[PDB]
Amino acid sequence: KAKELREKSVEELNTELLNLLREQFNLRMQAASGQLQQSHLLKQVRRDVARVKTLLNEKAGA
Amino acid sequence: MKQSTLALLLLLLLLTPV
Amino acid sequence: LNVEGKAPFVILMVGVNGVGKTTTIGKLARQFEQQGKSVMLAAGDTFRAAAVEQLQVWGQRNNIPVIAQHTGADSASVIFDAIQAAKARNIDVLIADTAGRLQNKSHLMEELKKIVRVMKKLDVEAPHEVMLTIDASTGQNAVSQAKLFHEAVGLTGITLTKLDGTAKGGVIFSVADQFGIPIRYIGVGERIEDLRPF
Amino acid sequence: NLTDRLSRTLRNISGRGRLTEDNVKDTLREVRMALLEADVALPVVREFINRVKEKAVGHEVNKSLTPGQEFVKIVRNELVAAMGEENQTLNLAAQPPAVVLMAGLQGAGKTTSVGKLGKFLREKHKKKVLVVSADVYRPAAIKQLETLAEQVGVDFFPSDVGQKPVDIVNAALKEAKLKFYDVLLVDTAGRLHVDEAMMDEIKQVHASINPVETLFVVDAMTGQDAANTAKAFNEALPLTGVVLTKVDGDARGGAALSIRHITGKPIKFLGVGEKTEALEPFHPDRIASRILGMXXXXXXXXXXXXXXXXXXXXXXXXXXXXXXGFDLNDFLEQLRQMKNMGGXXXXXXXXXXXXXXXXXXXXXXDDKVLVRMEAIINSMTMKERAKPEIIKGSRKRRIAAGCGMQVQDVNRLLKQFDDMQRMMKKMKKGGXXXXXXXXXXXXXXXXXXX
Amino acid sequence: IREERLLKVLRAPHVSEKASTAMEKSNTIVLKVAKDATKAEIKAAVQKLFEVEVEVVNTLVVKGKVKRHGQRIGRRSDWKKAYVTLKEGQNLDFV
Amino acid sequence: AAKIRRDDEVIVLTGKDKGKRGKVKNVLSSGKVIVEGINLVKKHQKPVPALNQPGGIVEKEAAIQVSNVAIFNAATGKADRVGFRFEDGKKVRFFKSNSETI
RNA sequence: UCUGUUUACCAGGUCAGGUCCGGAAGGAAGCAGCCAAGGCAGA
Ligand SMILES: Nc1nc2c(ncn2[C@@H]2O[C@H](COP(=O)(O)OP(=O)(O)NP(=O)(O)O)[C@@H](O)[C@H]2O)c(=O)[nH]1
Ligand SMILES: Nc1nc2c(ncn2[C@@H]2O[C@H](COP(=O)(O)OP(=O)(O)NP(=O)(O)O)[C@@H](O)[C@H]2O)c(=O)[nH]1
Ligand SMILES: [Mg+2]
Ligand SMILES: [Mg+2]
Ligand SMILES: [Mg+2]
Ligand SMILES: [Mg+2]
Ligand SMILES: [Mg+2]
Questions:
Q1: d(CA D54, CA F18)
Q2: What domains, with CATH codes, occur in chain C?
Q3: Contact yes or no for C25/C41 (Cβ under 8 A)
Q4: What is the distance of C-alpha E65 from the center of its chain?
Q5: Using an 8 Å Cβ cutoff, are C7 and C61 in contact?
Q6: Closest CA to D294 of D84, D87, D10
Q7: Which chain D residue has the Cα nearest residue E16?
Q8: Closest C-alpha among A29, A26, D437 to residue E20
Q9: How many CB atoms are located within 10 Å of the residue D442 CB?
Q10: Is C39 annotated to bind ligand?
Q11: Site from F46, F48, F51, F57 to mutate, D interface, most D CB atoms within 10 angstroms
Q12: Which helix (H) or strand (E) holds F58?
């Protein structure tokens, strides 16, 4: 990603980030209940979050 | 009855994966 | 199909429950007796209630000797001894019945394999033919049927039955595309003359 | 075998968080192509999957937001309400007389199903059953019914090919009313729905008998023609219900769905083996769950069938363990009794919690292993069975040589009996709720499989 | 409060016999929550995320045990447990 | 700049397999490779019920030092040594003897 | 000369179960249970 996210406005990013947090919450809720088969997902989302955040900053920064 | 379920359930079962 | 030149030429009939194996055997028996072939029948269904009697009745109607044994006896046995009586009467073709079995049971597939091995041990070259009977009302599940049946007994042929119904039996296309197994006959009713060449 | 395709499908969905409607779509498409691979009523595939598509758009669950639980739950419950809304317990309504007919296509399983019903209702009803074959057409069909009837211990009414089906069934009904029977099972010849002389003939038959129930018999492998068959049989004959057979094959038998779409008649029974005992009450929860791979209804039904055939023998093993303690006598009794109820697919489907950790391709052959155990413990002197700790090297040479097997196997079996001895003791000493709750599922660390 | 903080509070359902007991008998659920979250934020977060009505949240802190792995002495991390009272009104279930 | 890679057909210079040829399954970081039909060991496996793993002696393939295997020239039928050049703008491998690309 | 009792494989017979050969037809080595029996104690 990260080219893809780069072309979105700050608002859509802010809707995306919250979505990612809901997804993350749900995922670790699954993993905590031992119902999670693919674990590769946590890392997927946990990192995507960072990506988004790192953009928000530079859009405010400059 | 109970003791039936108890015994044979984890008898058959517990025999398979253990 | 060429049944010429063997003492006898033996055809194994395989397929899941109710597809038309025993009736098809009847039909083939007629078809080849019409061509001047000497034909006899193995009832290789010693498992299901009246599975042998049913074929014996067909053979009684067609004046075709049917080798028969008790319920609970071995199918492969009746098939072998049928090959033997076949040789003894100097006949061209024995048609070996088998009990219906679901292809995914997979022990019964092995039973069929055993039968094959039997016909192999009597006549080293036999059977030269393994035919799978498929119902027309069936379909892409019969894909899987063709899979486990061909994987098991190495089918040399396929006969589609109940094509007198509304079913087009299109699943053949997907089967023949996969396994390259030739379609031999189409069954078009419940009488003795109801077999047709594909 | 939808579970291969449906597993990749709905498991795929159950992975992705806040799933796009596109993999929702693709998954629906794989359910469509899956039921298309099952040769279930292809137009009805399209209809069913369109329904599942519309249902799967807007659901929310606070328990777990996972959309895969939504697709599994939706496909399940929807197949449930379309298949008759959890009708297991209900079955057929019994009146003091009852007359039921079995109708359908050539080879669907009618004659077999008649004898299954005979046995089942013989067990549940505590009443008298009479059966009759209206089939003068298929060779030895009447004899087939006679054999099955003799096997299930059910009175048989004689008939021959020289008669007319109407006269036959009229005679049967007359004798039945005269001899005070209740449940009557009439097995009819297989016939094409487009064969007018036959369909008319049995319209006349029905007219003569006046049955309370007409059951259409469906091979689970039946194709797209099902909807056309069910309708035809429902328009002339009309049927009051459906029996779905050969569900022990990998065929998904959703064709009955088409059959229940046109007819609207309930589906009462699941034929699940070639044996007389193989009649089950149909249940959409059981067939849909059976497709999905994890089941609560079939878990309670196979634990209640295991418990029904094993009640007096686990009370015999509990009385001998009350007197002499747990031995290879009480274990061997458990083995023969356990071999009589034996099946593997009805066992793994009862436990979804263990099947979530282990591959679904796991199978121990019960007919092999069980009878092997019975055999090995049949090779022991009675002192070695009541006192297993004295079994030694030469003894296991003797046991292994007796049944014609390997010493390693005997070691393995005595190992099993050792574990079950321990388990018997742990069950004996502790309270039932504590011994059942204190059982631990061990991971050598939370990191999985290692 | 901000929602972004909320979604970061609640780690996991706590599973045990005590837990089940309260859940059945007193209508109460048991949570492992971030070490720093407070009764306010947990009330907020359950009421928000599970969308059900919280009465009161009682909490405690569990000191992790001390372990040995291959002679080495480690310390399991601390954490915070929360007994969360739901009003008789709602019925909370694991599907 | 890695000389021996996945799926190359190689010939074995050293060890009990000297002279044998085969196909590379994978490489390991330590400079070890694992080759088809090469360097079978008989390993004893304690039966594991969770993985439905039976017991017994499993013949398995054990890693071999990559210095000991040579990239097999199919043209010459001889073991070869490898080198690198730039064709197009891309870095490519070739055989030293006939100086032909791979 | 009779009674109880015991005595796992390695005296004997039947040899269930299971297992080898065969396609079967059927044989077969034989564990267990039973009977002599090895005894002995009591008479
Ligand atoms: N309409 C029609 N019916 C057929 C045809 N071939 C067989 N049948 C019918 O289908 C039914 C089953 O036939 P049968 O020969 O017993 O099949 P099977 O495969 O031998 N049964 P099993 O597996 O129980 O031994 C019989 O009623 C029979 O008359 C056909 O070409 N058309
Ligand atoms: N595996 C399995 N086989 C079944 C089941 N129900 C019936 N069968 C089998 O399918 C075959 C056909 O059954 P049968 O009772 O003759 O069907 P039918 O509908 O009476 N045939 P017909 O139309 O000729 O009268 C028989 O081999 C039988 O043992 C089932 O639920 N499972
Ligand atoms: Mg037949
Ligand atoms: Mg019938
Ligand atoms: Mg308080
Ligand atoms: Mg406090
Ligand atoms: Mg720490």
A1: 65
A2: 1-198 (3.40.50.300)
A3: yes
A4: 19
A5: no
A6: D10
A7: D437
A8: D437
A9: 6
A10: no
A11: F51
A12: strand F57-61
